[PDB]
Amino acid sequence: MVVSIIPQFPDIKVSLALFEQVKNAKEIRSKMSELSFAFIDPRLVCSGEQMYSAIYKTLIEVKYNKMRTRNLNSECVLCLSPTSNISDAFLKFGIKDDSSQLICLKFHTNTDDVDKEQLRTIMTSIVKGQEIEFNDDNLSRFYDEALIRKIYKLSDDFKPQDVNGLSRALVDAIQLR
C-alpha cells in the first residue's frame, strides 16, 4: 500500500492499494452505499503516472473549478475517465461484478497522519483478496490495452512501443478534461 501527496496540496494524502485474486467484487459493489473508498478497475489503469495524473486533476478541479460528485474519491474516478458523463466513468472505471483485481483508493483530507494499520485492517475487512505492492511492475500485469484503446478512443495508427508510450496518451486525455 502507498501513501502519497501532490506537491501543491501538502495537506491532502492519498492512499492507493492493489489487490489480486479478488473474490467478492460483486459483494463490494452491493455494499458500496453502506460502507469511503473508490474501487477502481485495474484493467483501465496501466501505470502510476496515469493514476497520479488523475489525482492531480481531481485536486485542481475541486480547488479551482467545480466538484461534480459526492467526494474526492468519486471525483477521481471521474477524472480518470476521458468523459464528462459521471455514470459512464463510474461504470467503466469502477470495479465490476466479475473483477478479479482492484485498486482501492482513498483521499485523507485531515491534517494528521494516516493510520496505516487501521487502514490495512479496514481494507482487508472489505476486500476478499490478496494485496500486492502498488507499483508499475504489478499494474503492468492487469491493464487491458484493447479495452483502454476503446474507452480512451485511441486510433489503430497509434502504436506505442511500451507502457510509457501508452501512459502518455492516457495522461493527455486526463489532463485535457
Binding site: 506537491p7 501543491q8 495524473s53 489532463q175
Partner: protein, 236 residues
C-alpha cells in the same frame, strides 16, 4: 508575478525562471511521488488567463501522430493558466548554448558541410513535413522553436511552443510557416544560410514523396504557394 507562481505552487516546488507569460524549470514532478519520476527537470509555462488551452490540445493531438516529436504534456491547469511540459534539449558543449536549432547552426557555422549537419537539418524538414502533411500549422516556426535532443552522436529535432498553432489544410498557412523559418535562418546573415534551408526543404519534400501520387500533387501545391509567399514577402 514570481510571487503568485510560487504561492500557487507552494514552497515545495522549486522554480527557476528561464524566459519572460513566463517560463520556469523545476526539478519537481507535479504529481508522481518523489523519486518515482524519471527526468531531472521539467518546464512550467505560466500565462495569466487562448494560448494555454491551444498549446495543450495541440501537443496531445500531435503526439498521437507517428514520427512527430513534441514535448510531453504532463499537467494542465486551465483555470490558472499553467502547463507542465517535458524538458527537451541540453547545453551544447563548449558553452555554445541551449541546443535549439539556432545555436546548433551557429556552433557549426564555420564548417557545416558534414553528415551530422545535413542529416540533422533534413530531420528538421521531416518534422515540418509531417506537421503540414497532417494539416497542422505551427504559427511561429523560428529556429528557436526547434529543439535538438541528443541521441548518442546524433540529434533528434523536436518542435516546441505551439501557443499559436492551429489545424489548417490551407496551403497559405503551410507556406507562411515555411517562409517564417526560411527567413529566420537567413536572418543570421550566414554565408551558408541558403544551404541550410535547402537541406531542410529536402527533408520536407521526402515526407510528401513518401505519400505516392497524392503526396506529389500536394507537394507541388505547397511549393507553389511557398514561392508566391516569398515573392509577396519582399518589397515590390
Amino acid at each position: 508575478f514570481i510571487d503568485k507562481v510560487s504561492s500557487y505552487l507552494t514552497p515545495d516546488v522549486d522554480i527557476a525562471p528561464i524566459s519572460q507569460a513566463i517560463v520556469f524549470t523545476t526539478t519537481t514532478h507535479p504529481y508522481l511521488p518523489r523519486a518515482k519520476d524519471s527526468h531531472q527537470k521539467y518546464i512550467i509555462k505560466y500565462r495569466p488567463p487562448h494560448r494555454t488551452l491551444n498549446e495543450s490540445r495541440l501537443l496531445a493531438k500531435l503526439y498521437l501522430i507517428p514520427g512527430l516529436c513534441v514535448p510531453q504534456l504532463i499537467a494542465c491547469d486551465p483555470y490558472n493558466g499553467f502547463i507542465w511540459l517535458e524538458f527537451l534539449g541540453e547545453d551544447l558543449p563548449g558553452g555554445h548554448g541551449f541546443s535549439n536549432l539556432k545555436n546548433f547552426l551557429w556552433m557549426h557555422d564555420q564548417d557545416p558541410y558534414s553528415d551530422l549537419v545535413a542529416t540533422t537539418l533534413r530531420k528538421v524538414g521531416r518534422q515540418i513535413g509531417l506537421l503540414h502533411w497532417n494539416d497542422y500549422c505551427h504559427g511561429d516556426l523560428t529556429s528557436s522553436n526547434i529543439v535538438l535532443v541528443r541521441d548518442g552522436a546524433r540529434w533528434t529535432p523536436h518542435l516546441i511552443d505551439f501557443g499559436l498553432g492551429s489545424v489548417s489544410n490551407l496551403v497559405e498557412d503551410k507556406g507562411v510557416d515555411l517562409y517564417v523559418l526560411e527567413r529566420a535562418i537567413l536572418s543570421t546573415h550566414s554565408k551558408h544560410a541558403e544551404k541550410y534551408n535547402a537541406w531542410i526543404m529536402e527533408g520536407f519534400e521526402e515526407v510528401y514523396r513518401e505519400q505516392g501520387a497524392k503526396g506529389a500533387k500536394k507537394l507541388k501545391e505547397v511549393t507553389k504557394r511557398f514561392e508566391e509567399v516569398r515573392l509577396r514577402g519582399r518589397k515590390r
